[PDB]
């Protein structure tokens, strides 16, 4: 498998562009930025709102827990390569505690509202609008040779008042290289694509489109998360139960993938459940035939058959968003 678009971005660029192991960090000055309060955490960091002491601006300060040299230069390089693209988080500075050497990444401040409280108040139009904004970022980073590989609500910050959105947390992102084989322990479980669940290692950009489809399904059907498996074998069952097992078998054989004896036994046999079987009282104001057509074109086992970010921004599901813009 090779990507149907942008396949050659890193092939034509100077090696310094993608050879992140050759980066040397220009360290800024730790004292320019003071932590004000904690706002987030994860496996690999703590995240604080802070202040720039020179100008009195807000910022966000992301302190990293101990990380390999290699891993951390990948994140920074990708962040620098993409600074200035539409809806991509802006890295402002990189700094370190002198005594302990702990690195901190400094970012623009976004004034966010948690997805779990925000989404259930979003209108049909708002849903269209923010997915579109999110699609801008996706097309941008794919156009520059990068997969994000961790799309999900927790990683998309939104200031509902300014109607702005940024894609965050580039910790798991990689450069795309034609034919390169990749680690499948990426994305978070509810947003992992079939290719990862079955060990096809030569994935591309299209993985981020499955995750988006997951995020989308969850938003229109009011069902967080949409595919709810307890572990990686359960995640694939939970997909096969909606998409049906016929599609799976064609996928496997197309790419000649032997499934695992036990997994195959878990997955079983299941027919296709139509998208409309998920509509209910709480959700029918958000589910329309354009929403479903769009969703259907994102969630395909075959990664080569999903829409590109660039083809999705033009589906008629987003027509009114496009016309607000052109004016």
Ligand X SMILES: Ic1c(I)c(I)c2[nH]cnc2c1I
Segment (H or E) for 232? helix 232-243
How far is Cα 133 from Cα 141, in angstroms, rounded to an integer?
13
Shortest separation between residue 221's beta carbon and ligand X, angstroms? 25
- With tokens 């049906």, the residue in question is 244
Among 3, 47, 95, 167, binds ligand X (CB under 6 A): 47
> Is the Cβ–Cβ distance between 283 and 220 less than 8 Å?
yes
Is 193 marked as binding a ligand?
Answer: no
Q: Judged by CB under 6 A, which stretch of 29-37, 105-113, 223-231, 275-283 contacts ligand X?
A: 105-113
Q: Which of 45, 313, 13 is nearest to 172 (CA)?
A: 45
Structure tokens at 242: 């909606």
What is the four-CA torsion angle of 311, 314, 316, 320, rounded to 10 degrees?
150
Is 180 marked as binding a ligand?
Answer: no
Structure tokens at 306: 């999903």
Shortest separation between residue 187's beta carbon and ligand X, angstroms? 17
Would residue 126 show up in a list of annotated catalytic residues for this protein? no
Shortest separation between residue 62's beta carbon and ligand X, angstroms? 6
Among 10, 81, 87, 112, binds ligand X (CB under 6 A): 112
Q: Is 133 in the site for ligand X (CB under 6 A)?
A: no
Is 224 marked as binding a ligand?
Answer: no
Is 44 marked as binding a ligand?
Answer: yes
Q: Is 39 in the site for ligand X (CB under 6 A)?
A: yes
> Is the Cβ–Cβ distance between 128 and 320 less than 8 Å?
yes
- With tokens 């033009």, the residue in question is 314
* Number of Cβ within a 10 Å radius of residue 119: 19
Shortest separation between residue 91's beta carbon and ligand X, angstroms? 11
Among 18, 33, 50, 62, binds ligand X (CB under 6 A): 62
Catalytic positions are: 150
Annotated binding site for ATP: 39-47, 62
Residues that bind ligand X (CB under 6 A): 39-40, 47, 60, 62, 107, 110, 112, 157, 168-169
């Amino acid at each position: 498998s090779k990507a149907r678009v942008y396949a050659d971005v890193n092939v034509l660029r100077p090696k310094e562009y993608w050879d992140y192991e050759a980066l040397t960090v220009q360290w800024g000055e730790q004292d320019d930025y003071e932590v004000v309060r904690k706002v987030g955490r994860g496996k690999y960091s703590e995240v604080f709102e802070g202040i720039n002491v020179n100008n009195n601006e807000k910022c966000i300060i992301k302190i990293l827990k101990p990380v390999k040299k290699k891993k951390i230069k990948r994140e920074i390089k990708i962040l620098q390569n993409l600074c200035g693209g539409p809806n991509i988080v802006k890295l402002l500075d990189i700094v370190r505690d002198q005594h302990s050497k702990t690195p901190s990444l400094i970012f623009e401040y976004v004034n966010n509202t948690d997805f779990k409280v925000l989404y259930p108040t979003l209108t049909d139009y708002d849903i269209r609008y923010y997915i579109y904004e999110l699609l801008k970022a996706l097309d941008y980073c794919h156009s520059q040779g990068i997969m994000h590989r961790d799309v999900k609500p927790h990683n998309v910050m939104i200031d509902h008042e300014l109607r702005k959105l940024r894609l965050i947390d580039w910790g798991l992102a990689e450069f795309y290289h034609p034919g390169k084989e990749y680690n499948v322990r990426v994305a978070s479980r509810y947003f992992k694509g079939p290719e990862l669940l079955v060990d096809l290692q030569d994935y591309d950009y299209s993985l981020d489109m499955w995750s988006l489809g997951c995020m989308f399904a969850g938003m229109i059907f009011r069902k967080e998360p949409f595919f709810y498996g307890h572990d990686n074998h359960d995640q694939l069952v939970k997909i096969a139960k909606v998409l049906g097992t016929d599609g799976l078998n064609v996928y496997l054989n197309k790419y000649r993938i032997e499934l695992d004896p036990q997994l195959e036994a878990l997955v079983g046999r299941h027919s296709r459940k139509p998208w409309l079987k998920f509509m209910n009282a709480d959700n029918q104001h958000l589910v329309s035939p354009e929403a479903i057509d769009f969703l259907d074109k994102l969630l395909r086992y075959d990664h080569q058959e999903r829409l590109t970010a660039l083809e999705a921004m033009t589906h008629p599901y987003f027509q009114q968003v496009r016309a607000a813009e052109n004016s």
